[PDB]
Amino acid sequence: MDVPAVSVSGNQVLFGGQAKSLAGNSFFWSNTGWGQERFYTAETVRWLKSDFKASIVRASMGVDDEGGYLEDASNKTRIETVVDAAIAEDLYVIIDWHSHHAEDYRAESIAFFEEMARKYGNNNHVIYEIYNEPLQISWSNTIKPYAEAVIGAIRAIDPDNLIIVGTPSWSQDVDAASNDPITSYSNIAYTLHFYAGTHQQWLRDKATTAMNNGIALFATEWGTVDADGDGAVNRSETNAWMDFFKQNNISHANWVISDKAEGSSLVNPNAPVSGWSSSDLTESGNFVRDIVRNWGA
Template identity: 65%
Template structure:
């Protein structure tokens, strides 16, 4: 009997410490494994057979003399486990570039083994990453032999995850990536039958939807790589990921950043939180890029930070601080979803913009307007929303719902369950994406409060709710101000974020050229009327901007941006614009570039 076969036997009961072979006899020392096996069931990577997700860190490229290799030691792994509460690390072994595996195979493999051994010793999961952009163009046998060694030496543990192609560039999934992946997977599976294998996807591991249309067949426990950087990638990439999930493949975010896709720029807090909500809701594990002290936004450490862990907060970058907070609070906690701001009524509220929830998931919707809806709703699930009711009275609340089967029962309540404002029966609409609108009238007291939608019975989806005063006189507040940080865009093209010297600090949007644009979605305009709109700008030369509906039409106003004699010499440009009430998507267009933008402010003008 081969030792590997015995390992497989004892792994099924999640127990093994060592196997000793003497004179043809096999002796097994049995103990409880410290981490649960990972397995794929549909679009979920299960942890010990249960839904959940891991949060941790990716090391920088292992390449010699690139700067990040000094952190490839057991002390940093132990510190990430004890101080950051990381459950996952990723050894990013550079392959074809200078100082990588093709140039120094022994040295780079040794670094990987150090991280793997340390992760196992610290009861963590570890990704062994073939960190290449061109793996399918090289001699596949080099990857095959490497992963066979890893599988032979570590495949008996539950800790190890194989990432066989980091970030393919813009190449064909079916013609280029998939054949390579099937070859490497076959080699690994000849030794390790069940540890998780993750496969890169086209366009720097963003086109996960392409893989979902032609997934790898014949092998168990295969997941697909999703990479994103919050400063560059927004809802459009989450929509692609949602398509992949809907098509039934499991995703794993083996690399992500809080900053721009080039690894630089400031932290995009709003988009980072949106991504964390998406990952948590869909049980997608993730590893942040990167443990390094390089002078770039994505680095977790400031230059000169110790190579052996023990980092005080002062040794962490802005990104490092944000990521540490995310990881430390990940297990057993649900991060707040995007747009958890107090909404002034009357307003239309997208269902997925809840402030908190229990049990539900977010998915792409086929309803008019696109975007997302809330689904997978079971009895006892709920979502909550913070609202500001301008005055006490009766309010008509409409709900956009769909159901396949017997329908369900929706209850509107104050968060916590009491008081209950009303219930509605949800009809069978014939399909999860056949939508109808139902409504009732309920009393609401004035003031800021958190309302909730709870499921009294399961089997329905919800896209949005619309809350309007029953008497047609919502009596909006006298002082309405909408403040938008420029870097909190939903989508953009061409721009970058950077640190600002303006009052209040933080970030501004810069590197703005003609034809660039920014979009800000789900902006609640409480009442129709004239608004003073202010743009906080700086420029080295003259430029212009347009304030418009996202997509470019209509254009509400165009403003000249004056030369302020410096990229950080700030001034405020203001004008008047008429806006209709409701939740809207606004855009900033760039007829002439050469300026920076820090914030936008809308203030209602008294009639």
């Protein structure tokens, strides 16, 4: 095994037994026709590894909207392209069921994650993210029962690899999850998402409570801009979050590898799929490249 195994002990996600924070980058919605398919390539993964010094990539598979996995198996193929490349490159890779409604498609999630666990669960690289961003729904009554069903299905095949579970309110309410944690399975962490224009110390305080209640967090998506993925790059608030992640050994992936005309995109419209120069990178992209490159200092 050429990368260390990911596990959880108390409020820390460990890599080969070590508490630390790793950094990387999320792909956009995989959905056919949404414009960002062209970045789901081995070339792009290699460039993130070499030039961003990324440790993690996140493959964000659309599920239930037009063009998503429920309608079009090509979404899975794009995920596989990135997973295979991450394994070959000795990067961690998150397989993200990129839904806001996963409780409505429990059987389909189970079947997908069983397939992924069969294909990939003996690789230490692979991490499962079973529910991107629940909405304003109950942790105990809606998310938790979905999550226990999917986790049990994964764990029957793949006993060890990390599973990360979304939390209420766009993966903000990690404190609610921490009040009724998933104790019946090992190596479970919980999702925290922030955007620097929208979520400030109040959300850090909720995350701090969650960790001090005993659960481990993984910041599988965050942006430099506003929560809608557009707006001004907010350096000072981004940097306050980065300091909080480094202090608390929380790993993270930035939104997003995309050339869509919105502030969160790493690259300008029509940029090449890899090899990005500073003119190819957006204001966010240039700043994120510096954060991820220097993360290991």
